[PDB]
Design a protein around this nucleic acid. Structure first.
Lengths: 65, 488, 271, 169, 263, 182
RNA sequence: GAGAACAGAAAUCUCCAGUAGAACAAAAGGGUAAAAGCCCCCUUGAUUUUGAUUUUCAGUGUGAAUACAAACCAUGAAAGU
RNA sequence: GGUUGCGGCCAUAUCUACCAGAAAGCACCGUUUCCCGUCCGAUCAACUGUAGUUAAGCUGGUAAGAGCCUGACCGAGUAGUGUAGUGGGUGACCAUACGCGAAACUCAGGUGCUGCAAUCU
């Protein structure tokens, strides 16, 4: 992970860095080898967390494309 | 985007002083140099100083008695061509240049529309860069006039995908190995079904190969050689359309078929074993080589570039009769191959155990060297047109450059971010293009082991790449159903 | 008539604005283009259409006013084998290809040199006052100059066959405009339902019996001859310039003197 | 002399004025639709009065322009109603001439009860060939003086075709 | 709405500045010889120039209010005014303004031997390239008016600023030399003005890197004598040389890497 | 033929402007307005300077790239560019430096206490019945909704609401003008 | 100006004459006419990522505002804006 | 010397009225099947160079036709504005100085030059 871009239900929790369900986070995607038009190399994108990671350990997220 | 760190304050205050203009002072305190070739020649005691690096060339021309070009180098320590004293008796090594310059391929011509499925295979005509063939994920192949960037002569006649296309080494017919286990031949200028679909295999066709022109009977035409997923290797004569005689040695699927300079077919298969067939012995394997641990993909010969054109040199001319044609073809093969006077064609193997092997199947049945260092399977390997450089691509995003005579390690070409599917050499053996699972194509300058240009423009993966013979165009295509030509 | 004070007041436009040939708003955007990053020269390919002529010129501006590098005119197409239709799509294509191949040769590419590299030649399209329509024959010259091996940024929205609601090109309809295919469809379509307007139109065709096939067959050989010889051999130019000078000093009118107007006034006052 | 400087016609213009936007305007457009084979346009106002019972931008008038053969076709067909009667005026200083009539049904057209009785206008503008010198985009110019069209040229061109009268000076 | 806010905000004081625009003003006493040089001086300043057509009666060394008004109107920092008379024939006035107020003014006077591209052997040069510079003679480093002439011609004939520069643009050099040396007290010697165009050949004494260059004279060719001046006040000098303002033991390494020393 | 030439006092360079400064010795009796050999001296005393200057310019660091045509920025792979240093001569500006620091009494009130600025995230709000995202101001803003409500439930109240909004708008503009006059 | 059925002082239609006496985010000595005027086509924008100014009590790697820069974004055949 | 394409200066290049134009080119001019646009193939697009035309377009000349500009010792280094010695002032502040420093009438003259490329009885 690289940042917590936006957490619903408050901006204070976005500041504190909380990872509840629905949070939007920024992940490093150099392992997927994405190239943009003009030939640059993406290494950071947005994903949404899709579980309550207080009822397990994993944080599960879906990329935003 | 991510930025290079800006220069400091003291660095800005440094960059304003006067700075370091060289002068070439006098400069002939003469050093005795040793003119010695690569193969065997050491030709003989001359003591010049700081003279023109293009006058060393003329020295060698007048000495070896030809007035040709020569490239130079020294002290094979960092092995670099007054420039021998600015950084620091001293020797001199040279190689022949065969000057025919190929400008890089930078721009992008029009993205030609075409088939309705992905594009699987592509090939360039050996006689002119004006025509070019592509077999695609539909049941057809297509011919493209690269002169005007336009289509032509779509060749319907299969009913499953076309997995390999080949243009005969005389520029007379084109062959399309397909998924339905048929094999069809077509006329360039007409587009008519030249007979019916040859067949005899139980599963799909993997690779094709042709008879090299310098061995074909003048007054006749070359023959075929076909691999198939079933395991058979079949021969074909393109006048009677009859299966001459098959070969059934391997046990798993067979990947690739070759054809040497003395009439020795080589074949690597998914059975982890490379077999050396024969044509003067009616097709009984005479050598089996088992060195790999996993299965083998894309074997490659030392002269598979000269054996691909067959008397159509880089100047686009044509032959009128098999008499002159055979002499031109023999001259080509000898120019490419004769670096000691014998038939010293080597072979390189690429297998799924991350390692390549350097065979000389004629002289022995042992590998000369084991080339290693990759970290995932090696999908493709290739020899330089002059035969003294091996390039290898792999699914670990890298490309590696080896010394093609004994099998040392030279360099790595980083820059792709996904798997490298295949590579290709230019005519003068100085550039190298490569395609990858991500969009971009990359052009590398071998003379310095760096990246020359990086060209995007596709939208999905790219499966084929083919540089022309005179270096005028580069063709590519893949998952986005468009053909693409790149020029200088 | 006109008010003398108004005529003393009003100001005149530029000469070439008066003779309405030049577009001085486009010219600023096309000459003072960037122009704050570096100091790199900027050539420009111009293409012009009169009646019975296709003109192409690689123009480079300057302080003194302009310079021309390489030019091409459609009226040379017989030298390579095209006699009919010297103003159509195929003629525009051939002229573009010819100018591109000629300048490519003259620059010394095939058959301050520090930091060595060929550095392909970049030029731009000076459309002048031509209207931009999908299919116009000012983009055919562009296509030809590009396929000759020159580099001219462009797009496809103005090539024949671009479909609007589905933004993609069509290859075959484009290929059938490089070889006069439209004119040949016209010929084969009109050769039946009319013969009056097949002997009136295409009247020059019959005096050599060029049919509905050899168009595509001669255009290719024209391209081959062009790529073989762009060297631009001039005209022999009979009647060395002095002859024309003495000839057209005859029909040339002439002014008068001051002692001529000086006597006519007294002649009037006497009359 | 007249090598090619004849006095051919250019175009006919029709017109109907209705200070409203209603079924009157719709059928006034319809008659032009069915007559000229082309489609007619509407034209708005430019500023209000409030005395003539109108507003601004009310799409007042309908009209069509017709060139070629269908210009002279109506130019002739609409003459029998005026019965060849054209005065000195209804011409112009530039020779442009026209008139205006009533009772549409006097030429071909039937009644179609739900149209009404619609009166119309006419017009014709003349030129010697070479009308591009002003309408072209490049090197746009203005015609000379020997080539201008005054009243005499046009009135003789009229006392050439259909040989109508002078009708009061 | 914003098409006028744009033309308004273009004329705000910026941390990094844009090219200084030049204004060409023919006074009341203008002649044809004097006016066939304004065009040749605005050629080498194209495109950042603007010329007024008719004559404007402004005497600069008495009342400069029309000059400052023209500055504030035309949004041009430079001013070249053309005048002629018996006491001063072929007089040109060079003004540069600061904050729509006068900074310094200087008169120059032309001789009779000027030259034009209608006189010379014509050569080529693209419209908009940045010229080179040469200032010969040592008086430009020490003497006041000779410092002023250099600091004026640089400000006038340099155009854009750039960090990267292509080499196909280096195509002409401007040069200024004092006519001979002098001891203090003597009149201020004449300053010349020359414009050339380069050409380079293979050398063989310096490899393919350094060539042997050659010059050709294109035009113009002017001489200049000093007239009246108006020098900058100390406050304005200290207010016109200001850097816009945009760490011990702390360094930035390559790769980023803010680092610190501990000693 | 020589690409070099010597001069006693070293030329000073300004590569940030492509400028040379020579300070050697001239000869008063060579450049006089009538000397025949005048141009053949000017054009050479300047040619040696240009030679030194090209020598200095052709030895700077070069900046290559790997891009290709279409690149939105500038140069491509087939252009080497010289990295010019910065100029040194103090040439004067044309306008003073920009500085305007007024606190407008809101930056004073908000700073005496701890009112921090807002995050400036987005412009949309969520309408509840209906179910859209309805810009707070920017298209049919939630303000201009009591205007077209189909009944208000208490003179027309909607027009009074419009007037009450306009009063605050005009007060804000007046406050701004007062602050700018301070 | 001169003309076209109802048509007039002010309704619509057509030809020869504003160097601008109209309309211009707008006020000018001077500008805007193949537009900065009037029509038609395509479209977001309070985008995202670190150096200068200040301030956070979870002193808090950007956490946010703020100034500037770059990658993008829109349009165009393009030059470019 | 004409004509065409692209240009610098931007009325010595314009507004007005007649006259001449051989060859080459420019134009008017011939047509609507295809790409493309309009109420209308008029302008914009497409094709042949085909049936005609030198009438306008275009260039040039002429005119005590209107506009425009050039130069001169035309004014004159003067009027105008600034200091000065003691050049004077009950109060009113007033004459010829060195350095800045103008226009209208006067006189004479003109009514397009120039860069690159191709070509033309």
């Amino acid at each position: 992970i690289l940042a917590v871009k936006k957490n619903p239900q408050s901006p204070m929790y976005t500041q504190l860095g909380v990872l509840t369900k629905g949070t939007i986070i920024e992940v490093n995607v150099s392992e997927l080898g994405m190239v943009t038009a003009g030939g640059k190399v993406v290494w950071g994108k947005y994903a949404q967390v899709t579980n309550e990671p207080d009822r397990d350990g994993c944080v599960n997220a879906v990329l935003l494309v | 985007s991510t930025l290079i760190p800006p220069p400091s304050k003291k660095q800005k205050k440094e960059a304003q002083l006067p700075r370091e203009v060289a002068i070439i002072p006098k400069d002939l305190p003469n050093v005795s140099i040793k003119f010695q070739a690569l193969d065997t020649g050491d030709n003989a005691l001359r003591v010049p100083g700081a003279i023109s690096e293009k006058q060393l060339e003329e020295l060698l021309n007048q000495l070896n008695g030809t007035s040709v070009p020569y490239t130079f180098s020294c002290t094979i320590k960092a092995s670099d061509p007054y420039s021998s004293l600015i950084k620091p008796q001293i020797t001199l090594l040279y190689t022949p240049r065969a000057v025919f310059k190929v400008k890089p391929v930078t721009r992008s011509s029009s993205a030609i529309a075409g088939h309705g499925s992905t594009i699987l295979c592509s090939a360039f005509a050996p006689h002119t860069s004006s025509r070019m063939v592509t077999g695609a994920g539909d049941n057809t192949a297509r011919i493209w006039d690269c002169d005007t960037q336009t289509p032509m002569h779509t060749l319907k006649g299969h009913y499953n995908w076309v997995l390999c296309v080949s243009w005969s080494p005389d520029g007379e017919v084109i062959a399309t190995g397909s998924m339905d286990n048929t094999i069809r031949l077509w006329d360039p200028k007409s587009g008519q079904c030249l007979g019916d679909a040859l067949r005899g295999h139980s599963k799909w066709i993997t690779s094709l190969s042709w008879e090299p022109i310098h061995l074909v009977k003048p007054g006749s035409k070359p023959r075929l050689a076909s691999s198939s997923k079933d395991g058979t290797i079949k021969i074909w004569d393109t006048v009677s359309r009859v299966c001459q005689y098959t070969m059934s040695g391997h046990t798993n699927s067979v990947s690739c078929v070759k054809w040497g300079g003395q009439g020795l077919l080589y074949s690597g298969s998914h059975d982890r074993t490379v077999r050396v067939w024969d044509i003067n012995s009616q097709g009984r394997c005479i050598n089996i080589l088992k060195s790999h641990a996993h299965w083998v993909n894309h074997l490659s010969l030392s002269t598979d570039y000269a054996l691909r054109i067959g008397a159509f040199d880089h100047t686009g001319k044509k032959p009128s009769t098999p008499e002159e044609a055979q002499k031109k073809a023999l001259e080509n093969y000898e120019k490419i191959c004769k670096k000691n006077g014998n038939s010293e064609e080597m072979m390189v193997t690429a297998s799924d155990d991350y390692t390549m092997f350097l065979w000389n199947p004629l002289k022995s049945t042992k590998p000369i060297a084991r080339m290693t260092g990759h970290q995932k399977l090696v999908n493709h390997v290739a020899f330089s047109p002059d035969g003294r450089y091996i390039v290898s691509a792999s699914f670990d995003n890298s490309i590696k450059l080896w010394d093609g005579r004994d099998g040392k390690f030279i360099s790595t070409f980083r820059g792709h971010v996904a798997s490298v599917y295949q590579v290709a050499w230019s005519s003068d053996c100085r550039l190298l293009v490569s395609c990858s699972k991500d969009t971009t194509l990359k052009v590398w300058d071998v003379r310095t082991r760096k990246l020359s240009v990086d060209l995007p423009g596709h939208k999905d993966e790219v499966y084929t790449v083919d540089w022309s013979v005179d270096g005028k165009r580069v063709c590519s295509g893949g998952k986005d159903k468009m053909v693409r030509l790149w020029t200088h | 008539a006109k008010s003398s004070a108004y005529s003393s007041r009003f100001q005149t436009p530029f000469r070439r604005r008066r003779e309405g040939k030049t577009d001085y708003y486009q010219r600023k955007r096309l000459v003072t283009q960037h122009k704050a990053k570096y100091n790199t020269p900027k050539y420009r390919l111009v293409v012009r259409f009169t009646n019975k002529d296709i003109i192409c010129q690689i123009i480079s501006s300057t302080i003194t006013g302009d310079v021309v590098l390489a030019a091409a005119y459609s009226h040379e197409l017989p030298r390579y084998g095209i006699t009919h239709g010297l103003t159509n799509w195929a003629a525009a294509y051939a002229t573009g290809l010819l100018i591109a191949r000629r300048t490519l040769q003259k620059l010394g590419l095939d058959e301050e040199a520090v930091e060595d590299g060929p550095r392909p030649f970049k030029v731009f399209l000076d459309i002048g006052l031509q209207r931009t329509t999908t299919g116009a024959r000012v983009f055919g010259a562009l296509k030809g100059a590009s396929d000759g091996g020159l580099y001219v940024p462009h797009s496809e929205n103005r090539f024949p066959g671009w479909d609007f609601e589905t933004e993609e090109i069509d290859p075959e309809l484009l290929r059938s405009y490089i070889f006069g295919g439209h004119v040949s469809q016209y010929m084969e379509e009109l050769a039946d339902d009319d013969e009056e307007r097949f002997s009136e139109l295409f009247k020059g065709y019959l005096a050599d019996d060029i049919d509905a096939d050899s168009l595509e067959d001669i255009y290719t050989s024209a391209h081959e001859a062009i790529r073989a010889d762009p060297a631009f051999k001039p005209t022999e130019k009979k009647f060395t310039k002095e002859q024309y000078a003495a000839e057209s000093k005859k029909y040339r009118q002439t002014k008068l003197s001051k002692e001529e107007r000086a006597a006519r006034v007294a002649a009037k006052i006497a009359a | 002399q007249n090598p090619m400087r004849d006095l051919k016609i250019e175009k006919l213009v029709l017109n109907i004025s209705v200070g409203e936007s209603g079924d009157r305007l719709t059928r006034a457009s319809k008659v032009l639709e069915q007559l000229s084979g082309q489609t007619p346009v509407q034209s708005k106002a430019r500023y209000t009065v409030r005395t003539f019972g109108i507003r601004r931008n009310e799409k007042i008038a309908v009209h069509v322009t017709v060139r070629g053969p269908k210009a002279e076709e109506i130019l002739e067909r609409g003459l029998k109603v005026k019965e060849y009667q054209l005065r000195d005026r209804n011409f112009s200083a530039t020779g442009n001439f026209g008139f205006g009539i009533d009772e549409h049904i006097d030429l071909g057209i039937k009644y179609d009860p739900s149209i009404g009785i619609f009166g119309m206008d006419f017009y014709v503008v003349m030129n010697r060939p070479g009308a591009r010198v002003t309408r072209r985009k490049r090197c746009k110019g203005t015609v000379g003086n020997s080539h201008k069209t005054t009243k005499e040229d046009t009135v003789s061109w009229f006392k050439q075709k259909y040989d109508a009268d002078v009708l009061d000076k | 709405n914003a098409r006028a806010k744009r033309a308004l905000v273009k004329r705000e004081a910026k941390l990094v500045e844009n090219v200084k625009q030049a204004l060409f003003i023919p006074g009341q006493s203008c002649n044809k010889n004097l006016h066939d040089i304004m065009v040749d001086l605005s050629a080498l300043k194209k495109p950042d120039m603007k010329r007024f057509n008719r004559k404007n009666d402004i005497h600069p060394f008495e009342d400069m209010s029309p000059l400052e008004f023209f500055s504030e109107k035309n949004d041009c920092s430079l001013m070249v005014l053309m005048t002629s008379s018996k006491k001063r024939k072929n007089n040109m006035t060079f003004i540069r303004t600061f904050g729509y107020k006068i900074y310094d003014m200087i008169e120059l006077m032309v001789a009779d031997n000027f030259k034009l591209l209608s006189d010379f052997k014509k050569l080529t040069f693209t419209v908009g390239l940045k010229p080179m510079f040469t200032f010969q003679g040592a008086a430009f480093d020490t003497h006041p008016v000779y410092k002023q002439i250099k600091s004026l011609f640089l400000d006038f004939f340099r155009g854009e600023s750039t960090d990267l520069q292509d080499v196909a643009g280096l195509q002409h050099v401007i040069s200024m030399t004092i006519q001979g040396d002098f001891q203090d007290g003597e009149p201020l010697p004449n300053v010349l003005f020359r414009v050339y165009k380069l050409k380079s050949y293979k050398s063989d004494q310096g490899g393919k890197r350094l060539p042997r260059i050659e010059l050709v004279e294109i035009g113009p060719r002017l001489d200049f004598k000093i007239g009246r001046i108006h020098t900058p006040s100390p406050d304005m000098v200290t207010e016109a040389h200001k850097k816009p303002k945009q760490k011990k033991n702390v360094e930035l390494d390559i790769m980023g890497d803010k680092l610190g020393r501990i000693h | 033929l020589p690409v070099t030439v010597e001069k006693p006092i070293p030329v000073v360079y300004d590569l940030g402007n492509l400028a040379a400064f020579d300070s050697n010795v001239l000869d008063k009796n060579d450049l006089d307005s009538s000397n025949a050999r005048r141009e053949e001296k000017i054009k050479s005393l300047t040619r040696d300077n240009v030679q030194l200057l090209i020598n200095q310019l052709l030895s700077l660091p070069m900046k290559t790239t790997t891009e290709s045509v279409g690149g939105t920025g500038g140069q491509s792979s087939v252009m080497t560019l010289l990295q010019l240093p910065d100029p040194t001569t103090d040439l004067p500006r044309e306008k003073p430096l920009p500085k305007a620091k007024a606190m407008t009494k809101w930056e004073k009130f908000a700073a005496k206490k701890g009112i921090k600025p807002k995050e400036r995230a987005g412009k949309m709000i969520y309408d509840e019945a209906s179910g859209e995202w309805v810009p707070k101001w920017g298209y049919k803003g939630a303000n201009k909704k009591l205007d077209d409500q189909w009944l208000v439930e208490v003179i027309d109240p909607r027009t009074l609401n419009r007037a009450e909004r306009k009063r605050l708008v005009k007060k804000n503009e007046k406050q701004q003008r007062r602050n700018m006059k301070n």
